Design a binder for this molecule. Structure first.
Ligand code: MG
Ligand code: ZN
Lengths: 76, 129, 253, 265, 233, 150, 221
């Protein structure tokens, strides 16, 4: 199961994210709320956890983080 | 010139009828289903329309045969292995869970729908199927 | 549409150097059932480069039903073909058997009307001969300067509280019902609930979103569209007492 | 760059040279929802990473054209910028074209090669008798000739006028996994991350399998759109979606590259 | 006359022998101009040693069988084409490989004459069975690029001689692609991504330096004619 | 119902199968379901039910027990089924706004917004994908093991 | 078996505007890409002069006509694009073409300053009558390849100045063919012969030398 390397938005790969959260629909909010938090930190102020890029976006950071298993979620 | 607008209207009606049908819960748990053909008497055979009828769906009943050595239980996604294993096992009919026979009050339950085509896994617990 | 404008060098060229002006896809000939463009291309080549049907002692067989005073023709020789009784396959076939007026003394095409093109991109000659020629092509009135639109934020219409539509009026695009169905079929809830609220109708949303994006803050939660408020107030004006309330506690308009 | 907002608004309004260094830094993984009216099916909208291009046209991907039912015969498309983090996410996860290769109809890969790519790969992979650098298996005097140590060697033998891409040559492969029957007869214990095995194929089939993923077994067949369909279906059901997204893109690039040197005119 | 600014080059090693070089950001077009030339140069041009023809004890007019080994003449040839070498002769230098008894024959078991050196002694050739001895003569030549099986009254005339396709080229597989990259305002400024897989002998950077050398030495001939209207660095 | 449920699918797939298109049955079955989720009442009524009306199956079953009614299976047109809904907004949006607004207004019926086409109209996050409470109200906290070093 | 002999670049001549060049020996199938490099360098990036902006004192924009001329100002501009000129100074130089009364205004009637040369005096621009007087100044600048008609609104240029789509390409056409020369046996080599055809702004030699120079500069190690 080799893809050489991902690039841009397709990094990180979705199948490795779907393992982490219950479903893509959860993963969306999972990433989104975290991203809204990361957005807020620059201005709930926790993060960024993983060492971010120089000019990197909160969505990329959030979607990177979920893949790393630095976060945990509760389904309402 | 006519086809596109007619197809659009058909699409509109078919959307506005099934606008409410979502995957509300995971499993309501019902033994009811539909009996798919899947190799009717032979070889002594594969149906041409297995991919449309049987594939990417959860099984309703435990796949009992003449002996009763249940090769597969109820609630399997029906990959080719399952179909060729059931063809090899020696049964000429399989009972699959359908939205048709889903006991869920609001929307449908994920299991009854089957493996979602978009994802390729078990349908998610909010999809507007 | 014009895919790419290839810098003349990289575009494939004829062995004399002449770089071809357009390339049309082959696959869009058999399925579409218009081989007129190919005949027009060929007879185009026959027309552009001067030609002389090297007659013989008494005419060639392929030009038996051929017109007189059209055996020889010079460079840039304009040709007429009556739409239903013009040039034919066997006439074109022989016609492509032309002279070599390219200032050099070598022919570019062949008897089949297939030139050995050179790839300007790689540098190599393409492994099979290509149908080059001179198709008369027309620029249509469908131009990007008319059709291209863009709108982050600008003027909103007075009577309808969505962006006034138009290329001329610096307008946004129509996010229709069939677009909403596709969005719902995904289940991109927040997307649709952004598009049909702060990105269109919501007067507090359309002003806050710009400020929020330019400041670089969280996009504020889309409240209620003007398209709901207008329906609410319309039904209140129709004397239908519509009221908003949750499980515990009633809401206010 | 800008002292205050208004000077930034003015700078971007004026289209000054400094904006272009920033606009990529801004657009970096900030997806856009492309729509083609009439919006029939779910994939009739798809999210994409916007790469900046000089011009006044939207450079769509060739595969997603079937997912839009969009020809390039004047057909317009509508870009939408999802603004919210939630929207940006929804775009990225749900409806980013890579993530939804399979149609919501038969679960068949809709983003599969069509038109040029198909004839490209068909030519690329199809076998031809009486070709250049062909497998002869000579008697008494000469060796077998059409036998090559590496796909590299075969590529060098192709680029230099000596080998024809559609020749039934015997190549010794390392990176690629063999056919299911030839897996058993050779190794049947260790794997082939950097081992070696001989295949009686076409250079083109090796250049094709080079596109398909590492652990995917060999095909050794002419790539009919149905064969591509069942291959990308097998990739879809067996492998992750990103592997499919990438492999079908390599199939696109290779397909188009070989569509030219196909000689379909 | 002209002034192009920043044609910067950077290397990105994948393996010890494999590398991706990136040349950027070139003026709209220049990617393909130097790309295919750099490729075909890297392939065809750079001078290197290789096995041109071999001869094995026993085979006078056999198909592809050698007494007392598991492998075939074809597979042996295929393994020997892989046998990478570096000579300082510029002439056909003859090497002898002999091994007796069971087991395997590795690349280190060969005895290279003065000038020639094998860079990877830990490389498989053939598996020998019990009660057998392999004695093979390899004709090593210097050359450039890829050269198929030569039949110049040497391979055809001689009894035990067999010719093999010579991969003189120190580089095995060089491919390349180009992408648009914004530089100031305009896009379509080409960034050359050039992918190279060398043999252990020479380093990709040294191969590219040699290719660049032969290319600049070549177009020097053209430059020399006038050398009036030029570009910048 | 179960035989006609197969008959519809069989008779509506055959056209796609003939015209070289492939849809999976379940998709049709979501429509063929939405068709056969109603009953026509013959007599008795019990709780002010009309003879020859269109009432939903699950809510009819809840009344049918009568702890202290005669309804037959009916197959209705997708337009009639789309017209036959509890949510007054959707019925008003579909067709005959006056007829349904008048019928609803007198009844003083409270729309639950269980359907999404209403949530589109009122402009609230839709009950599907990423707008259901179990998704949209997900509380993600970063793990103490990750927050420890930071 | 090396071919220890550097490639000889021998210059033929078919015309003063167009010339062949033969390069040999080379490695089998190495010629095509070598020729392509030269071709692509030539057709793309060669230093050249051309008309950047014209300014007729009478007419105030492109989309009108001059009194007593046959061709309209658009077609005059479109013909003045067809001119071939060469300049030494890369800085912007202003040529003058003044003609009063009747006759055929040709490219040869233009009066360039010191260090600017017109290389097609025969070329037809406009045909006049006794009523009509054509006074046009043509601004020339040294560039390379093609540039779009730069807008005078952007720069500090007056309403009178008309931009024209400059073509800084003194090469007109380039091609090449490679001879197989010798069979597969006894080290086969590829000889490339390239035709270079200029506008007469510079000779093929100068162009090919400029291209070769550009490629030599462009191959960094
Ligand atoms: Mg169309
Ligand atoms: Zn259920």
């Amino acid at each position: 199961s080799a893809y050489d390397t991902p690039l841009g938005i397709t990094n990180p790969p979705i199948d490795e994210l779907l393992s982490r959260a219950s479903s893509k629909y959860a993963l969306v909010i999972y990433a989104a709320k975290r991203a809204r938090q990361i957005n807020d930190y620059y201005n709930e102020y926790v993060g960024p956890l993983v060492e971010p890029g120089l000019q990197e976006k909160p969505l990329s950071i959030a979607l990177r983080e979920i893949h790393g298993d630095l976060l945990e979620h509760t389904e309402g | 010139a006519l086809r596109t607008a007619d197809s659009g209207y058909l699409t509109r009606r078919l959307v506005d009828v099934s606008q409410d049908v979502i995957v509300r819960e995971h499993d309501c748990e019902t033994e009811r289903g539909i009996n798919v053909t899947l190799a009717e008497r032979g070889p002594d055979i594969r149906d041409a329309h297995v991919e449309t009828s049987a594939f990417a769906r959860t099984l309703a009943t435990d796949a009992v045969d003449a002996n009763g050595n249940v090769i597969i239980e109820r609630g399997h996604d029906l990959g080719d292995p399952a179909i060729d294993a059931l063809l090899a096992a020696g049964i000429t009919t399989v009972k699959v869970r359908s939205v048709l026979t889903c006991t869920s009050a609001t929307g449908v339950c994920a299991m009854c729908y089957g493996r979602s085509m978009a994802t390729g896994k078990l349908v998610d617990i909010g999809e507007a199927v | 549409v014009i895919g790419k404008i290839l810098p003349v060098e990289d575009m494939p060229f004829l062995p004399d150097g002449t770089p071809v002006d357009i390339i049309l896809n082959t696959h869009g000939v058999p399925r579409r059932m218009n081989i007129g463009q190919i005949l027009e291309t060929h007879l185009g080549w026959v027309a552009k480069a001067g030609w002389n049907i090297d007659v013989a002692a008494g005419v060639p067989d392929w030009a038996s039903k051929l017109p007189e005073e059209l055996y020889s023709a010079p460079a840039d020789s304009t040709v007429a073909t009556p739409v239903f009784d013009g040039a034919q396959e066997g006439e074109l076939a022989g016609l492509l058997g032309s002279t070599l007026p390219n200032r050099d003394g070598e022919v570019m095409v062949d008897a089949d009307g297939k030139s050995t093109l050179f790839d300007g991109r790689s540098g190599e000659p393409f492994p099979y001969p290509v149908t080059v020629g001179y198709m008369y092509i027309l620029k249509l009135h469908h131009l990007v300067d008319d059709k291209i639109h863009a709108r982050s934020t600008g003027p909103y219409s007075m009577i309808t509280q969505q962006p006034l539509g138009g290329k001329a009026q610096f307008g946004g695009q129509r996010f229709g019902e069939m677009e909403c169905w596709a969005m719902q079929a995904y289940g991109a809830a927040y997307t649709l609930q952004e598009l049909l609220t702060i990105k269109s109708d919501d007067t507090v949303g359309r002003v806050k979103v710009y400020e929020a994006i330019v400041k670089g803050e969280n996009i504020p939660e889309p409240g209620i569209p003007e398209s709901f408020k207008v329906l609410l107030k319309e039904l209140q004006s129709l004397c239908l007492n519509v009221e908003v309330l949750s499980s515990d506690g009633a809401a206010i308009e | 760059h800008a002292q205050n907002i208004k000077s930034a608004k003015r700078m971007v309004e004026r289209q000054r040279p400094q904006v272009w260094d920033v606009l990529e830094e801004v657009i970096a993984e900030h997806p856009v929802l492309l729509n083609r009216a009439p919006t029939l099916h779910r994939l009739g909208i798809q999210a994409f990473e916007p790469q900046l291009v000089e011009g006044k046209a939207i450079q769509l991907h060739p595969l997603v054209c079937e997912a839009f039912n969009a020809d390039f015969d004047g057909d317009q498309m509508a870009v939408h910028l999802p603004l919210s983090a939630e929207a940006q996410a929804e775009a990225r996860i749900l409806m980013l074209s890579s993530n939804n290769i399979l149609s919501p109809a038969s679960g068949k890969p809709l983003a599969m090669p069509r038109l040029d790519m198909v004839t490209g790969l068909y030519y690329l992979t199809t076998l031809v008798e009486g070709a250049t650098g062909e497998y002869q298996a000579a008697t008494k005097d000469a060796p077998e000739q059409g036998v090559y140590s590496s796909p590299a060697e075969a590529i060098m033998a192709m680029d230099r006028g000596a080998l024809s891409v559609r020749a039934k040559i015997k190549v010794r492969l390392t990176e690629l996994r063999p056919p299911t029957d030839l897996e058993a007869q050779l190794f049947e214990n260790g794997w082939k991350p950097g081992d070696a095995w001989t295949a009686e194929t076409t250079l083109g089939r090796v250049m094709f399998n080079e596109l398909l993923p590492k652990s995917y077994p060999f095909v050794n067949e002419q790539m009919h759109k149905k064969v591509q369909a069942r291959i990308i279906n097998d990739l879809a059901e067996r492998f992750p979606m990103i592997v499919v997204a990438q492999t079908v893109d390599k199939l696109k690039d290779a397909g188009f590259y070989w569509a030219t040197r196909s000689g379909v005119t | 006359m002209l002034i192009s600014q920043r044609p910067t080059l950077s290397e990105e090693t994948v393996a010890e022998n494999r590398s991706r070089f990136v040349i950027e950001p070139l003026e709209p077009g220049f990617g393909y101009t130097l790309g295919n030339s750099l490729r075909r140069t890297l392939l065809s041009s750079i001078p290197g040693a290789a096995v041109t023809s071999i001869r094995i004890d026993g085979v006078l007019h056999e198909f592809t069988t050698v007494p007392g080994v598991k492998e075939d003449v074809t597979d042996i040839i295929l393994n020997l084409k892989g046998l990478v070498v570096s000579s300082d002769d510029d002439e056909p230098v003859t090497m002898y490989l002999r091994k007796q008894g069971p087991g395997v024959v590795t690349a280190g078991d060969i005895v290279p004459p003065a000038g020639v050196t094998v860079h990877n002694p830990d490389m498989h050739i053939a598996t020998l069975n019990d009660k057998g001895k392999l004695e093979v003569e390899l004709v090593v030549e210097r050359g450039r690029g890829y050269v198929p099986a030569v039949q110049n009254k040497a391979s055809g005339a001689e009894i035990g001689r067999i010719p093999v396709d010579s991969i003189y080229s120190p580089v095995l597989k060089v491919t390349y692609k180009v992408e648009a990259t914004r530089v100031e305002q305009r896009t379509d400024f080409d960034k050359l991504i050039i992918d190279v897989e060398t043999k252990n002998s020479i380093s990709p950077r040294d191969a590219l330096a040699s290719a660049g050398g032969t290319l600049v030495e070549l177009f020097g001939l053209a430059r020399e004619l006038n050398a009036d209207s030029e570009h910048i660095e | 119902p179960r035989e006609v449920q197969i008959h519809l699918v069989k008779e509506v797939q055959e056209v796609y199968r003939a015209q070289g298109v492939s849809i999976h049955d379940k998709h049709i079955e979501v429509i063929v379901r939405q068709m056969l989720r109603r009953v026509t009442i013959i007599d008795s009524g019990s709780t002010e039910f009309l003879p020859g009306s269109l009432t939903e199956r699950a809510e009819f079953e809840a009344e049918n027990r009568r702890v202290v009614a005669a309804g037959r299976p009916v197959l209705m047109g997708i337009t009639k089924a789309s017209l036959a809904t509890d949510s007054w907004l959707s019925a008003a949006s579909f067709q005959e706004t006056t007829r349904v607004l008048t019928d609803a207004a007198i009844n003083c019926r409270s729309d639950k917004l269980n359907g999404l086409k209403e949530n589109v109209i009122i402009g609230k996050l839709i009950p599907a994908g990423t707008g259901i409470s179990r998704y949209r109200n997900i509380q993600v906290q970063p793990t103490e093991e990750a927050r420890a070093a930071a």
